[PDB]
Amino acid sequence: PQAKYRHDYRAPDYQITDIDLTFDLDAQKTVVTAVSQAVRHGASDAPLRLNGEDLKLVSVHINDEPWTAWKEEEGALVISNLPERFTLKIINEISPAANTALEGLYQSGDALCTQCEAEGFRHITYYLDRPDVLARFTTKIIADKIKYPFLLSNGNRVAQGELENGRHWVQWQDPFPKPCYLFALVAGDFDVLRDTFTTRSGREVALELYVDRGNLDRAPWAMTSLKNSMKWDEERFGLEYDLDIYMIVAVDFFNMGAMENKGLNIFNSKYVLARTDTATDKDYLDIERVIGHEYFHNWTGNRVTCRDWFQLSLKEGLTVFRDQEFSSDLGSRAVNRINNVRTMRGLQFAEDASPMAHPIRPDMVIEMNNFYTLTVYEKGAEVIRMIHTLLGEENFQKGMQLYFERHDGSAATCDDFVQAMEDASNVDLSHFRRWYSQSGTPIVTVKDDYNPETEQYTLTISQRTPATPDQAEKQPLHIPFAIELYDNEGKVIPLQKGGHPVNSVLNVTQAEQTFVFDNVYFQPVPALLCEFSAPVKLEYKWSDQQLTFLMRHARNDFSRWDAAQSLLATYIKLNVARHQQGQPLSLPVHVADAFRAVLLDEKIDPALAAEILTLPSVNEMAELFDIIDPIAIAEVREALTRTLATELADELLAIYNANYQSEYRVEHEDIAKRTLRNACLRFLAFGETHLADVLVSKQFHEANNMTDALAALSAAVAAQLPCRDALMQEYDDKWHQNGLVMDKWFILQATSPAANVLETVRGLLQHRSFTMSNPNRIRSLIGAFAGSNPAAFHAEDGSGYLFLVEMLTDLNSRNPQVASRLIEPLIRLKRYDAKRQEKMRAALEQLKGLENLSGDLYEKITKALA
Ligand SMILES: NCC[C@H](N)C(=O)O
Ligand code: NA
Ligand code: NA
Ligand SMILES: [Zn+2]
Known part of the structure; x- marks a missing residue:
C-alpha cells in the first residue's frame, strides 16, 4: 500500500460539474448508472483517472458514444482522448450484501445505506473521489416497494413513480454542489418522527428522523437536540439551515459514529435512541453533542468543504469546537471543559507520544480512515480554541464571517481559515500556524x-x-x-x-x-x-498548600478541579512506585482533608464537587509515567478509592443521601446532583462490605432510570461485591434483546477487575447478544477489554495480546476500520517494560504476516515495528 503526501497536492486535470445517478437497487446486485458532465482543465493528453474499488464495469460512453479509449488499472478507470467538455456515462454493478466493511453502499439489518467519507464513494461508482471536486447531484432510486418503501437521498424529492412488478422509484435533487463524500442514500422501512423548525428569518424546515419500526418512543430527545442545535447555531454564530428538509436516519450497523451527509445525516443508532430506562445521563448528553456536531457541519464542512483530506481538521477541529461551545452554553461550561481536558491529557497526549503521532494537519497518509483521530478532532479543537483565546469572541466571529464570505461554496485549506481569522482580527497568526504542522x-x-x-x-x-x-x-x-x-x-x-x-x-x-x-x-x-x-x-x-489554596479560592471552577488533579498526581506517582516495591498506599492526612472539605462545602456546585471526586482514569494516570505499569496503576486507583472510602465514610453517605432525587430529569442541575451522588456511591461500594452490598443492590433495584441502575451495577462489578452475579444476571435477563443496552453490560464484563476476566470475555463471544458483524458489539466487548482493561490486557503471560491477535485476524478481513480502532492498544508497546514489549512486538509480527493484510492495519503495524 502506498503513502500519499500533502506537498503533492495538485489541482485536478478534470472537474465534474453535475452528476445524475440512478440506482437500480437490490441487496445482491445493485446496478448504478452515473451520468457526469465533465470539463478538462489540464493538457489535452492527460487522461481522466477515475477512482473505483470492487466495481464491476458494464459500459462507458462519452457523449453517448461507446468509448474504446480506456483501461482498468489497480483502483482506477483511466480514460483517454477526451474532448474539453463532455458527458461521461458509466454503468457498473456492486453488491451491497457482500459489503462487510460497511464502506460505500451496504446492508444494515434490512435497510440499505451508505457511508462515503472519506473515500467510500469510489466503492459505488468510478468517480473523481476527492473533495475538491464539487458537483450538483440528482439521484434516482428504483427498488422493491414492499421491502423499500422509503427511498432517500440528499436534498429535495422532485419526482416519483410506480413500475410493474411491485417496484417504485423516487428522484432527489440537492441544489448545492458537494464533494461526493457527502453523498448519501438510504432505502428501507422505518417509523418517522416528523417535526418542524422555523429559522430566525422565517424559513420553515421539515425535520424527519427515521428509526427502525417500534423505536419511535426513543426518538423525541434527538429531535429536541436537533432543534436546540439549530437555534444555538443561529444565536451564537448567526448561521441558518439552508434547505427545506433535514433528515436523520438511525442505523444499527455503522463504523463512524455519525455522518454529516448534506440534508441526510446517517447516525449510528447509539447516538439517536434514548428512553430514561435504557439510556444514561451521559447517553443523553452524547446524543445532544453528536446531533449538534453533525448539524454544525452544515456550515463548517458542507458549505465550506476540504480541499484534500490532509485538511480534515479544518472541518473537524472547528466542528468539535462548535459542538463543545454548544454543550458548554447549554449545560455546565466547567464540567464540559473538565471532560474535554481529561480526554486531551489522558488520551490525546498518549497518541501524540505514539508511533502514530501526527500534526493536526498530517503530512503523510497511507489509509485516510486511520486519521479520524483524537489529534485531528480534539487537539484540532484546542487549536481553534487558542485562536479564540487570542482573538476574543468578537474578533473570532468576524473571522468566521470572513471565512464564509471568502469560501462559501468551495473547498478550502486550514491555512485559508487561519488567514481569514488573521485578516478579520488584525492579530498576527504566522507563528501560530506552526501548530498545524508540528506534532x-x-x-x-x-x-x-x-x-x-x-x-x-x-x-x-x-x-x-x-x-x-x-x-x-x-x-x-x-x-x-x-x-x-x-x-x-x-x-x-x-x-x-x-x-x-x-x-x-x-x-x-x-x-x-x-x-x-x-x-x-x-x-x-x-x-x-x-x-x-x-x-x-x-x-x-507546586506545594500541596498552594494547590489546596487554589481548590478553595480559584475564580474559575476548572482551576479548582485542576488544582485537585495536580494534588493527586504527586500521590498517584508516589503510590505507583510503592506498589512496585510491595508497599501499601501512603497519603498525607491533609490530602484526605482537602477532599473532605469538598464533600462538606455547602456553596460548591455539585457538578464541580462530582468531578473533583472522580479520580483520574487509568488512562489519565498512565500519562504521568514514562514507562507504564498497568497493574500498579490499576491497583493504586483501587486502593486510593478504598482509602478515601474509609477516611470519608460518614461524609460520603451523608452527601449520597442528601442528593437523593425521586423525579428523574434530563436537566443540568439534576444531572449534576445525580453525578455527585453516584460518585459517592462508587466510593461507598469500596468501604465496608455489608453496607456496600446493601446500598448497591438497593439502588439497582429501586432506580427509576438507567443512570442510577448502571452506576450501581457498575460499582458492584468494580468492587466485586457479593450481589454482583445476581445483578449481572438480571440485567442480561431483562435486556438481552436490546443491543444498545447490552453494550453497557459487555463494557462492565470487559473491564471487570475479576481474576478470570479474559476467560469470561472469551465466553461472551458466544453470548446471545454479541455478534462479530456489529461494530458496536465488537467495541463494547473486545475494544473495551483491550483499550479499557489495561491491567488484564497486559497480563504478564501475554494472554491479552494473543486474544486481540485472534480477533484482529477475523476483523482484518471482515471490517478493517474496526480492526484498526482495535489494534491501537498494541501499537503503544514502547510505553511498556522490555518483557511486555517483546510479546507485543511478537503479536504485531504475527499480524504483519497475515495474507491480505488491510492497508489500515498495515500503516499502523509498520509504524509500530519501526
Ligand atoms: N465526518 C465523519 C464522521 C464523524 N463521526 C464526524 O462527525 O465528524
Ligand atoms: Na452553560
Ligand atoms: Na519560585
Ligand atoms: Zn465531524
Whole structure:
C-alpha cells in the first residue's frame, strides 16, 4: 500500500460539474448508472483517472458514444482522448450484501445505506473521489416497494413513480454542489418522527428522523437536540439551515459514529435512541453533542468543504469546537471543559507520544480512515480554541464571517481559515500556524520569583517539544499562557507593569522568556495555564498548600478541579512506585482533608464537587509515567478509592443521601446532583462490605432510570461485591434483546477487575447478544477489554495480546476500520517494560504476516515495528 503526501497536492486535470445517478437497487446486485458532465482543465493528453474499488464495469460512453479509449488499472478507470467538455456515462454493478466493511453502499439489518467519507464513494461508482471536486447531484432510486418503501437521498424529492412488478422509484435533487463524500442514500422501512423548525428569518424546515419500526418512543430527545442545535447555531454564530428538509436516519450497523451527509445525516443508532430506562445521563448528553456536531457541519464542512483530506481538521477541529461551545452554553461550561481536558491529557497526549503521532494537519497518509483521530478532532479543537483565546469572541466571529464570505461554496485549506481569522482580527497568526504542522505535546516549564523589595513577580517560562517518531525537528510554538495571581485572602491581584495593565493571556513564543509584574503587593499563589489555555504539559513545582489554596479560592471552577488533579498526581506517582516495591498506599492526612472539605462545602456546585471526586482514569494516570505499569496503576486507583472510602465514610453517605432525587430529569442541575451522588456511591461500594452490598443492590433495584441502575451495577462489578452475579444476571435477563443496552453490560464484563476476566470475555463471544458483524458489539466487548482493561490486557503471560491477535485476524478481513480502532492498544508497546514489549512486538509480527493484510492495519503495524 502506498503513502500519499500533502506537498503533492495538485489541482485536478478534470472537474465534474453535475452528476445524475440512478440506482437500480437490490441487496445482491445493485446496478448504478452515473451520468457526469465533465470539463478538462489540464493538457489535452492527460487522461481522466477515475477512482473505483470492487466495481464491476458494464459500459462507458462519452457523449453517448461507446468509448474504446480506456483501461482498468489497480483502483482506477483511466480514460483517454477526451474532448474539453463532455458527458461521461458509466454503468457498473456492486453488491451491497457482500459489503462487510460497511464502506460505500451496504446492508444494515434490512435497510440499505451508505457511508462515503472519506473515500467510500469510489466503492459505488468510478468517480473523481476527492473533495475538491464539487458537483450538483440528482439521484434516482428504483427498488422493491414492499421491502423499500422509503427511498432517500440528499436534498429535495422532485419526482416519483410506480413500475410493474411491485417496484417504485423516487428522484432527489440537492441544489448545492458537494464533494461526493457527502453523498448519501438510504432505502428501507422505518417509523418517522416528523417535526418542524422555523429559522430566525422565517424559513420553515421539515425535520424527519427515521428509526427502525417500534423505536419511535426513543426518538423525541434527538429531535429536541436537533432543534436546540439549530437555534444555538443561529444565536451564537448567526448561521441558518439552508434547505427545506433535514433528515436523520438511525442505523444499527455503522463504523463512524455519525455522518454529516448534506440534508441526510446517517447516525449510528447509539447516538439517536434514548428512553430514561435504557439510556444514561451521559447517553443523553452524547446524543445532544453528536446531533449538534453533525448539524454544525452544515456550515463548517458542507458549505465550506476540504480541499484534500490532509485538511480534515479544518472541518473537524472547528466542528468539535462548535459542538463543545454548544454543550458548554447549554449545560455546565466547567464540567464540559473538565471532560474535554481529561480526554486531551489522558488520551490525546498518549497518541501524540505514539508511533502514530501526527500534526493536526498530517503530512503523510497511507489509509485516510486511520486519521479520524483524537489529534485531528480534539487537539484540532484546542487549536481553534487558542485562536479564540487570542482573538476574543468578537474578533473570532468576524473571522468566521470572513471565512464564509471568502469560501462559501468551495473547498478550502486550514491555512485559508487561519488567514481569514488573521485578516478579520488584525492579530498576527504566522507563528501560530506552526501548530498545524508540528506534532507532539509541548512541555512548558515555569519558574517564579517574588521580590519583596520591588513588589515584583517574575515568571520565567520555557517550552520544548520532544522529538516524535514522525518528525525529528521541532521548534517553539505560539503558546497562549493564561495566568491569575492570588493574594493571601484569595483575591485576584491586578496584572500590570510600569503603571499599565497587562493582558493575563501571556504570549509565550520563545524557547525561554521572562515576564515581570509590578505592584504585586503580596507573595502570590499563581493559577497557571488557566482553563487549559494551550494543549501542553505544565511543569511547575507546586506545594500541596498552594494547590489546596487554589481548590478553595480559584475564580474559575476548572482551576479548582485542576488544582485537585495536580494534588493527586504527586500521590498517584508516589503510590505507583510503592506498589512496585510491595508497599501499601501512603497519603498525607491533609490530602484526605482537602477532599473532605469538598464533600462538606455547602456553596460548591455539585457538578464541580462530582468531578473533583472522580479520580483520574487509568488512562489519565498512565500519562504521568514514562514507562507504564498497568497493574500498579490499576491497583493504586483501587486502593486510593478504598482509602478515601474509609477516611470519608460518614461524609460520603451523608452527601449520597442528601442528593437523593425521586423525579428523574434530563436537566443540568439534576444531572449534576445525580453525578455527585453516584460518585459517592462508587466510593461507598469500596468501604465496608455489608453496607456496600446493601446500598448497591438497593439502588439497582429501586432506580427509576438507567443512570442510577448502571452506576450501581457498575460499582458492584468494580468492587466485586457479593450481589454482583445476581445483578449481572438480571440485567442480561431483562435486556438481552436490546443491543444498545447490552453494550453497557459487555463494557462492565470487559473491564471487570475479576481474576478470570479474559476467560469470561472469551465466553461472551458466544453470548446471545454479541455478534462479530456489529461494530458496536465488537467495541463494547473486545475494544473495551483491550483499550479499557489495561491491567488484564497486559497480563504478564501475554494472554491479552494473543486474544486481540485472534480477533484482529477475523476483523482484518471482515471490517478493517474496526480492526484498526482495535489494534491501537498494541501499537503503544514502547510505553511498556522490555518483557511486555517483546510479546507485543511478537503479536504485531504475527499480524504483519497475515495474507491480505488491510492497508489500515498495515500503516499502523509498520509504524509500530519501526
Ligand atoms: N465526518 C465523519 C464522521 C464523524 N463521526 C464526524 O462527525 O465528524
Ligand atoms: Na452553560
Ligand atoms: Na519560585
Ligand atoms: Zn465531524
